Design a protein around this ligand. Sequence first.
Ligand SMILES: C[C@@H](CCC(=O)O)C(=O)O
Ligand SMILES: C[C@@H](CCC(=O)O)C(=O)O
Lengths: 290, 291
Amino acid sequence: TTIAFLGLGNMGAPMSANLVGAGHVVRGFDPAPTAASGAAAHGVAVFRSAPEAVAEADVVITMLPTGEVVRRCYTDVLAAARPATLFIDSSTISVTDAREVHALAESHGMLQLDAPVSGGVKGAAAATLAFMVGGDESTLRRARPVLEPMAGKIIHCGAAGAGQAAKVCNNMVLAVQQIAIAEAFVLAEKLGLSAQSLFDVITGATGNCWAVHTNCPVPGPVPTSPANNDFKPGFSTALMNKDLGLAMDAVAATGATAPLGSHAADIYAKFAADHADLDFSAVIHTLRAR
Amino acid sequence: MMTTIAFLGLGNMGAPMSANLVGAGHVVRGFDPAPTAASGAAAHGVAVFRSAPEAVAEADVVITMLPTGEVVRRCYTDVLAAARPATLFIDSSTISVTDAREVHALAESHGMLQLDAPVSGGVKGAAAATLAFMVGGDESTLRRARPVLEPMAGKIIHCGAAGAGQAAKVCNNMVLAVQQIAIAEAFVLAEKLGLSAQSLFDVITGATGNCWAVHTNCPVPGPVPTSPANNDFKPGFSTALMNKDLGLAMDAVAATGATAPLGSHAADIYAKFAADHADLDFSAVIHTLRA
Ligand SMILES: C[C@@H](CCC(=O)O)C(=O)O
Ligand SMILES: C[C@@H](CCC(=O)O)C(=O)O
């Protein structure tokens, strides 16, 4: 299989190197020369423009920063692709944007999936990413051997846009949970309940969740958690803030009532003005700001 | 070992609790101001008394299971001078941290050992003897108490000094309330986005967002056939009781000056929902997000 990989950033570059390593011919494009060079060093043939990269591809993967860039990339390459090329957008963009680009691609006789990922750069490099896929089951079947070498998990979430929707919904819950856990540790401390005691209880009770059992925002109970390493990401506040912005778009587009997710979004937006580079669990230290 | 236990408060939780102590071979002396409660407890082998002071007069251990801090405080004032010196008092009521510490000091000033040991698991846990006891107090007092707690308990966890049981419970349940609302918001958002409830369930449960409020308490019918959503939101854990816990959490926030934005927002949401839906499982809050 020949794959065109459009977007060779911090996620795209390690993903594309895993495809090289699984025996695919990978053609690439990125507007940053350093990204492009790095990718060429691990075997991607890099082209000066995206339509050139796409020209001989059986599969086109995009990993790009916004829906607007993804849409422009599609309109800039679709005429250059061969018929029934499989497009896979692994960017995290709105559900609306995803559905729009899916329909665009399919009106060209392409096959298209949304397949955004969780796991970050670390997962990208380790080939453990979780792909949450929207689109046709038979198209996912076709894509599977491409996704496998990048992936620890591949979940079909439903029709086009369901992958984006599933990720944004999970991440909105996660943000709420990370703040809630932080509130609980600070309350405990003021009540004279040790961090280890609270951790032992919550993890054995109804309140347990990854935000505590793995991302514990106080040092000690989980030695590997960011709190023990100066809140080095992990999962940055910048990225969490980005996902919550997409959750707020989805809430506005649907008229949904999401009082705690929206509150969480306000909290992280504000925290990202100061500490975008720290793991999102570091929110525990911004609660006195309100 | 077999012990004489006074059991003050024989309601929905105290009655099945006391029954299990009778089954384990303890002599249980009970009192409750509602004779209907006391009658049901008697039927299962509790010796019921005319007054709380009479029940405690010959007891090695005194357990309270009462509705509020005020009632616990009033009960201690009434009974502590009646009990034998160095009797072990265990309060398994859910009450404020401040109140717990006040009644603990009161008990000790009367010569009595005292633990806070609130429980989770509800009436079903109580009947099956699978309650979790979250204990505050001295380690040696808990050592003394273990053989009395075991026949009621699936888990006993020592949380720290007096008040720490109440503190650990109230912190967990505040978190639970926030998660239950947030899960509800994700499912209604999914619906509006055209993502199926089953698909969202599969995702979140396999991802970082997984928690009891979804895996066990899923607020949409279908994915978890045993959750309250499939049984007309019959409790389960009633809104009334979660509202009570959140009130205690807000008491703890107010007493410490803590900032708990989401916990306090969750308290506001549950206070409003409780006005009309006190009797529904607290997962039923999902109804407030659909127009
Ligand atoms: C195991 C995984 C794909 C292959 C891999 O480990 O890369 C999956 O089945 O989702
Ligand atoms: C609580 C005690 C056993 C009692 C029971 O399983 O009813 C234990 O597991 O610590």
